[PDB]
Design an enzyme around this catalytic site. Sequence first.
Site, PDB file in Angstrom:
ATOM      1  N   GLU A 110       0.825  -1.227   0.000  1.00  0.00           N
ATOM      2  CA  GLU A 110       0.000   0.000   0.000  1.00  0.00           C
ATOM      3  C   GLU A 110       0.848   1.261   0.000  1.00  0.00           C
ATOM      4  O   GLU A 110       0.528   2.241  -0.684  1.00  0.00           O
ATOM      5  CB  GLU A 110      -1.044  -0.007   1.127  1.00  0.00           C
ATOM      6  CG  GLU A 110      -1.850   1.295   1.260  1.00  0.00           C
ATOM      7  CD  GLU A 110      -2.755   1.582   0.077  1.00  0.00           C
ATOM      8  OE1 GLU A 110      -3.067   0.665  -0.713  1.00  0.00           O
ATOM      9  OE2 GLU A 110      -3.137   2.754  -0.070  1.00  0.00           O
ATOM     10  N   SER A 168      20.116  -6.970  -7.467  1.00  0.00           N
ATOM     11  CA  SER A 168      19.117  -7.229  -8.498  1.00  0.00           C
ATOM     12  C   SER A 168      19.555  -8.229  -9.591  1.00  0.00           C
ATOM     13  O   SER A 168      18.684  -8.950 -10.096  1.00  0.00           O
ATOM     14  CB  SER A 168      18.596  -5.924  -9.206  1.00  0.00           C
ATOM     15  OG  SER A 168      18.545  -4.850  -8.177  1.00  0.00           O
ATOM     16  N   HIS A 201       4.359  -9.766  -9.643  1.00  0.00           N
ATOM     17  CA  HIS A 201       5.798  -9.963  -9.553  1.00  0.00           C
ATOM     18  C   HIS A 201       6.406  -8.863  -8.635  1.00  0.00           C
ATOM     19  O   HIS A 201       7.333  -9.119  -7.789  1.00  0.00           O
ATOM     20  CB  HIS A 201       6.403  -9.917 -10.970  1.00  0.00           C
ATOM     21  CG  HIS A 201       7.895  -9.842 -10.944  1.00  0.00           C
ATOM     22  ND1 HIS A 201       8.598  -8.689 -11.220  1.00  0.00           N
ATOM     23  CD2 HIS A 201       8.811 -10.762 -10.573  1.00  0.00           C
ATOM     24  CE1 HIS A 201       9.888  -8.909 -11.033  1.00  0.00           C
ATOM     25  NE2 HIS A 201      10.042 -10.167 -10.678  1.00  0.00           N
ATOM     26  N   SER A 202       5.864  -7.648  -8.765  1.00  0.00           N
ATOM     27  CA  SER A 202       6.341  -6.472  -8.024  1.00  0.00           C
ATOM     28  C   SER A 202       5.317  -5.361  -8.181  1.00  0.00           C
ATOM     29  O   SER A 202       4.295  -5.536  -8.860  1.00  0.00           O
ATOM     30  CB  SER A 202       7.652  -6.008  -8.596  1.00  0.00           C
ATOM     31  OG  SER A 202       7.465  -5.283  -9.811  1.00  0.00           O
TER      32      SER A 202
HETATM   33  C1  LIG Z   1      20.339 -10.836 -15.095  1.00  0.00           C
HETATM   34  C2  LIG Z   1      18.918 -10.257 -14.981  1.00  0.00           C
HETATM   35  N1  LIG Z   1      18.030 -10.299 -15.991  1.00  0.00           N
HETATM   36  C3  LIG Z   1      16.772  -9.807 -15.875  1.00  0.00           C
HETATM   37  C4  LIG Z   1      16.279  -9.257 -14.667  1.00  0.00           C
HETATM   38  C5  LIG Z   1      14.793  -8.677 -14.648  1.00  0.00           C
HETATM   39  N2  LIG Z   1      14.015  -9.392 -13.669  1.00  0.00           N
HETATM   40  C6  LIG Z   1      13.954  -8.919 -12.377  1.00  0.00           C
HETATM   41  C7  LIG Z   1      14.350  -7.523 -12.105  1.00  0.00           C
HETATM   42  O1  LIG Z   1      14.281  -6.464 -12.811  1.00  0.00           O
HETATM   43  C8  LIG Z   1      14.267  -7.062 -10.650  1.00  0.00           C
HETATM   44  C9  LIG Z   1      14.922  -7.802  -9.680  1.00  0.00           C
HETATM   45  C10 LIG Z   1      14.899  -7.401  -8.355  1.00  0.00           C
HETATM   46  C11 LIG Z   1      14.193  -6.269  -8.017  1.00  0.00           C
HETATM   47  C12 LIG Z   1      13.553  -5.523  -9.010  1.00  0.00           C
HETATM   48  C13 LIG Z   1      13.574  -5.901 -10.339  1.00  0.00           C
HETATM   49  S1  LIG Z   1      13.141 -10.207 -11.573  1.00  0.00           S
HETATM   50  C14 LIG Z   1      12.841 -11.262 -12.929  1.00  0.00           C
HETATM   51  C15 LIG Z   1      12.033 -12.602 -12.855  1.00  0.00           C
HETATM   52  C16 LIG Z   1      12.834 -13.636 -12.035  1.00  0.00           C
HETATM   53  O2  LIG Z   1      11.975 -14.787 -12.069  1.00  0.00           O
HETATM   54  P1  LIG Z   1      12.292 -15.943 -11.006  1.00  0.00           P
HETATM   55  O3  LIG Z   1      13.712 -16.196 -10.904  1.00  0.00           O
HETATM   56  O4  LIG Z   1      11.367 -17.072 -11.351  1.00  0.00           O
HETATM   57  O5  LIG Z   1      11.828 -15.403  -9.551  1.00  0.00           O
HETATM   58  P2  LIG Z   1      10.356 -14.890  -9.006  1.00  0.00           P
HETATM   59  O6  LIG Z   1      10.425 -15.206  -7.532  1.00  0.00           O
HETATM   60  O7  LIG Z   1      10.238 -13.408  -9.212  1.00  0.00           O
HETATM   61  O8  LIG Z   1       9.319 -15.887  -9.728  1.00  0.00           O
HETATM   62  C17 LIG Z   1      13.453 -10.582 -13.971  1.00  0.00           C
HETATM   63  C18 LIG Z   1      13.455 -11.092 -15.428  1.00  0.00           C
HETATM   64  C19 LIG Z   1      17.206  -9.309 -13.600  1.00  0.00           C
HETATM   65  N3  LIG Z   1      16.968  -8.786 -12.388  1.00  0.00           N
HETATM   66  N4  LIG Z   1      18.505  -9.804 -13.781  1.00  0.00           N
HETATM   67  K   LIG Z   2      21.752 -11.432  -7.099  1.00  0.00           K
END
Ligand SMILES: Cc1ncc(C[n+]2c([C-](O)c3ccccc3)sc(CCOP(=O)(O)OP(=O)(O)O)c2C)c(N)n1
Ligand SMILES: [K+]
Lengths: 336, 336, 390, 390
Positions: free
Chosen positions: C71, C157, C286-287
Amino acid sequence: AHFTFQPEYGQTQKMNLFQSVTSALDNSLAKDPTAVIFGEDVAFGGVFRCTVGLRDKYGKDRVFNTPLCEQGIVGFGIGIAVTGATAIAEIQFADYIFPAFDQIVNEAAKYRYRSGDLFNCGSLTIRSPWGCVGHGALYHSQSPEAFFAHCPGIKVVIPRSPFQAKGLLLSCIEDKNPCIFFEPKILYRAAAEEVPIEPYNIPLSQAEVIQEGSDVTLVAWGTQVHVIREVASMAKEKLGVSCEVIDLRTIIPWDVDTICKSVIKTGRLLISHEAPLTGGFASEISSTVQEECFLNLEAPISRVCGYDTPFPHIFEPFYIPDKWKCYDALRKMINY
Amino acid sequence: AHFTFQPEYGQTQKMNLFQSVTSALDNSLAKDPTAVIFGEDVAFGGVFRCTVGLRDKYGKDRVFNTPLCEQGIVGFGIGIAVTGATAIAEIQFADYIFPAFDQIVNEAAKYRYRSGDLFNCGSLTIRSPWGCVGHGALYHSQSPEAFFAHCPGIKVVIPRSPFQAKGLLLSCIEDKNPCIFFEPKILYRAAAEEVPIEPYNIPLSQAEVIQEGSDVTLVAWGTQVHVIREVASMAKEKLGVSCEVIDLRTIIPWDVDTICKSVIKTGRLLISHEAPLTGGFASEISSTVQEECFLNLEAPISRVCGYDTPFPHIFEPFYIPDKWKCYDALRKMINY
Amino acid sequence: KPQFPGASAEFIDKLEFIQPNVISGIPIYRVMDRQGQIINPSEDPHLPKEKVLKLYKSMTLLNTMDRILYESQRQGRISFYMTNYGEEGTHVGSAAALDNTDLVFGQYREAGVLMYRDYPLELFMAQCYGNISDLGKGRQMPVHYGCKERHFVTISSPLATQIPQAVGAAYAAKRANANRVVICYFGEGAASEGDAHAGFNFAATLECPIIFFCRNNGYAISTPTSEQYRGDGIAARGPGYGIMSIRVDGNDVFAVYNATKEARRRAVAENQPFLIEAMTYRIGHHSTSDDSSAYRNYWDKQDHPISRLRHYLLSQGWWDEEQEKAWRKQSRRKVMEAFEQAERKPKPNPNLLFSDVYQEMPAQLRKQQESLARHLQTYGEHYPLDHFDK
Amino acid sequence: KPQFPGASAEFIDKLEFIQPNVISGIPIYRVMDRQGQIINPSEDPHLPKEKVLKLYKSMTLLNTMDRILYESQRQGRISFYMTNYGEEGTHVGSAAALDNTDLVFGQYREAGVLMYRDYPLELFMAQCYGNISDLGKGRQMPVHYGCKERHFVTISSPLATQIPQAVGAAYAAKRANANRVVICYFGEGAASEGDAHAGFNFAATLECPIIFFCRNNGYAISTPTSEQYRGDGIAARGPGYGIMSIRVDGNDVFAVYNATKEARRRAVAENQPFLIEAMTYRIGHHSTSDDSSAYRNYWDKQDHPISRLRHYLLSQGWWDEEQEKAWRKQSRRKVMEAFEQAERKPKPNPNLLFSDVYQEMPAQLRKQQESLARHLQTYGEHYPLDHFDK
Ligand SMILES: Cc1ncc(C[n+]2c([C-](O)c3ccccc3)sc(CCOP(=O)(O)OP(=O)(O)O)c2C)c(N)n1
Ligand SMILES: [K+]
Ligand SMILES: Cc1ncc(C[n+]2c([C-](O)c3ccccc3)sc(CCOP(=O)(O)OP(=O)(O)O)c2C)c(N)n1
Ligand SMILES: [Cl-]
Ligand SMILES: [Cl-]
Ligand SMILES: [Cl-]
Ligand SMILES: [Cl-]
Ligand SMILES: [K+]
Ligand SMILES: [K+]
Ligand SMILES: [K+]
Ligand SMILES: [Mn+2]
Ligand SMILES: [Mn+2]
């Protein structure tokens, strides 16, 4: 060869540059029980013999081979260093450091900052053979330092000789920041001089004026220091021109003050490096010097660099910024 | 916001910068049946909506998601292009382009040279969101162009507006060399103007003088063009100073002639960019301009850049080279 | 009979490709059903009441904090947030099976591990606000937590980079004769990165005491697992690297606990890696930057880790509606107290943008810090100075 | 019963880690014994005489060329060389099972595939000498061969980079409705790179018609496979990505042929990747820069692919000592004719250092080319000009 090598601290022995690196690594493992050395083919002594005898001396848990994966070698080394242990990673040719570029740039360099100093990888050093070798072509000749110079949080250091290499490598190993140490491979066997057996340090971020002069400043690093030393001799002889010859040694953070002090005195600067002109580190030195020494500059600053191409096999002799190319650029700068 | 956006070819519609990118991609897939678009999360339209509607229009074999692996996205794209098909790869934030740095630098850039033009990957374009966004912190704010500028064989292109982005992206897509196109993400929704519906090109390696002036040259690219346009307004108003405002557009190969021609006229140059000072691309422009315009320079060339730190979260407003920082540097350069 | 160095095997005299078993993959270990009932008494860990109550309270205090911070982001009070909905069991079940001093590397969706380790609400909120209490000095995006005192390495990140790092920290622990394990959490999308292949193989060949913990929640942003891989998930990859592997029901805190506890015991004893893939489902977006309805519950209503644990507590006589009501009020109060404090704190001095780039501050970076100070002296009315310390 | 998106599986109610089978790994497919005898008649490909003679002649002409070029390097006549000893069967057995127009990506130790495709001796030697006949314009190290006419993509030194590239070329072929397959060769050390994990997974999830061919020769320079991985070699990794996989005796040209031929048929029909791991042994040094006795035959004398094939030919009545003697003389003559020609050719004009960096030549790079030309006009006596064209 395109260059000629020319040769306080207790006993010395004559060492070539690979032997000076072994000596630095031996002294480090001896005094730091946490230190390990790892990478491709280091266990048998390495493809350039830099680790010969060290696994037998210190043990297989301290000098060991990794799988063939550079992103893993660097990530693994960061993790060792996060625990406080000295991690000395090898990357087999600098040309193959690029798979690990994300671990170096996004992780190692940023580790302390982004954690507020809760965690760090200060005890990591990455050492890698560097620079041209006569016939290394595109992937065994590269000089990647300008790629790393644009990354705050790492240090990048390049020695010109056996004495310099051992003292600067020990400083890298002991420095509390992740450091990349590039070893000019064309000097591994060629360059030999007296080197202290016991450990000693040469400071980082400190250039060395190896020859004083009053008419022009010449700056280079690695093997190219020997090229500009010869150019200085050619200028004195042929032109009656007095050159101040400076080895930069550390690419970042670099010694801005020593270079500007020299140019304030001479009024003229030529920088030379094997790496391509565009985006190469001479561009950072040239703008900074223009910014700080504008009123003292009598001529445009000259950059004599490799051409903006990949590094070729058969055309190497035409590619490198050799003594004739540097000499000719100097002659025009003096005539200006 | 730290900037203000201000707004021949047939019908136009008002488009923001993400919509101009979609429009360029739509026009490309329509006229080139070999073209595909792939990367993380592009199928549903992308995390910045740049590919909305394109999979429905062109098919799932032409607009598709890859596994989460940037070294794979770029290597895969090179291989598509080796066969002659147009490959438009997305990297989700420019900050995450580094895992693919070895595929870009050692492979894509060198592919044609090293094969004697037997093979190439000219039909590859990599597009990636770029630059600061207010709160992106270390890994959603980066501007990596100076890392790539030191690599002969790739082109690097950055637009300042919706009209510019569509025309430069189509030129990247159609150019016969691997191209990286960086999309300033802080403009994706903010900047909106009229954009031709049908395809059109803007040439690469060509700067644009967007405002003529006689006292000082200001050079920037991406969002920072809007900052220096405002600085020009501030200088005219406050100082009675006439500034020539130039958008560089292509980082490499860059338009040396347009910049030098301007500085020959004005005698003074300030370059500004969000990326860190040391090793940033302003250093290449500053030395080159000093080399070509030595006799015309009335003052040291000024570089107003991000500081040499990682990109911070809470301190962003203090980090960026904003209009006040550029204005103050200009004022001192004028006083010199 | 075959003599080749690279493999130990017999000859075969017929041509036969090895097929992956994907339709019948590695089974999913379960301890309690969706009604909180123990299925196999021999698998019940019989954790004591106070510890099971701590699992439950940690999950629900995390859930309370997630709702408030989500929120706060929607209102523009913090810049970004990521919730943990649906995955709270994977965090507390695993963290409860670790030693307090075992080192944790994570991804960003593992805040329940810090909550279990008693990280203060004030510090979760200091990091999201970037305020003077943040030991990270306001430098990273929200949810990029780290704590040296509780052995939780700062989140970053870039996905998967921590995987080979965790392996190096485990090699170092082995050398130090630590009797410590490292755990490394990552999602199924992150497991597609080259750094996951690096870390898995190094941990096996260098014999490191590490648990790889993959949260498989069905999506990586918009990408379903059908576009992420085609083998039998992440667990089926482990044996290929010579890693002992298991798949668990990540919505069952007891299955997660049992698998983690046994992996920890064996990794430390044997100096060998273990891989756990916890199957779960991302209930949230996701966020805050994601509207997940653009690409896709039964999970929230019919298989939730918190609900399953609540039913278990009731079965033992360890919880009731009166307790539930009291704790909901107390947890909201605790979170709201920390929230208000965090919002009222100033941000750190802008000088902190320049420290910790290197351990020391190089003279040219000090010159930049001085340049900012001069700048603010003249132009400071144009900056949000009244919000920053000093 | 389990409902999770990320895997298809049953529940299990007992805790059981999955153990890798490494001591009893994936068996090694064999067709002929070390005496050239067919073991299982149902597996005999019954390749016609002229084709089996071409396999044999290709292997031995390669071996002749390797011996001469290795010597040339030792004398300083070329700058570098890498031999193919022991691995010649993997190259010709596989190349014979491909269509002529199937696209090949390789590593550097696959020159027999080009020899089978009739690449001229003059062009292997032009590339090693960097002379005017090299279509690579003298720009890369020796053994970095490429041929557009024979669909062999130029080799590059960075290991494994061609793996995800090959997958992209296979995706493109699928789209083009090509009825073509891509084959991608790499060694077991290269398979440790992150790019191998990238390519394997992309080929499976994007459904690409590609054969991954791993030469497992026991060493990566000095590193034995015991320090390279701990699972059951490379073949055991394939199923984890959902890739149909097989291990073959790489010193048996017929086992290699059969596996490649069937993988090609199915990859093209089904748009699915196949993985073949060919077990072999690197008889040579890694390269002219390596003295392999620093870190380590039965293989040369007792299990060699060329010897095995020679015994087969004899059994059919297809070869004899007189033929062997004649071919040894003729092959030496052909190699020596090309060698002499190559040594007498000039190197290319130094202007070629500047072309093909981009398709066009940017004006600032032309300025650099002009600068060299001016330089040589004044200082050319200091350069090896009389060796270069023009
Ligand atoms: C190397 C690289 N490439 C792309 C991103 C962008 N990004 C992320 C990125 O931009 C990010 C990461 C952290 C905070 C804010 C934004 S997260 C993500 C999806 C990861 O999927 P998962 O491993 O299944 O975990 P989840 O628990 O979320 O299901 C992606 C694609 C990233 N953070 N790092
Ligand atoms: K990391
Ligand atoms: C990314 C990267 N890292 C390191 C190297 C150095 N190098 C190589 C390297 O420097 C090289 C490559 C090509 C020509 C000359 C030199 S080769 C090699 C060992 C590869 O082992 P393998 O995959 O099992 O194949 P082999 O048939 O030889 O048994 C190594 C380590 C490399 N070429 N690329
Ligand atoms: Cl070398
Ligand atoms: Cl953003
Ligand atoms: Cl303002
Ligand atoms: Cl000479
Ligand atoms: K260090
Ligand atoms: K292009
Ligand atoms: K390659
Ligand atoms: Mn996920
Ligand atoms: Mn090998």
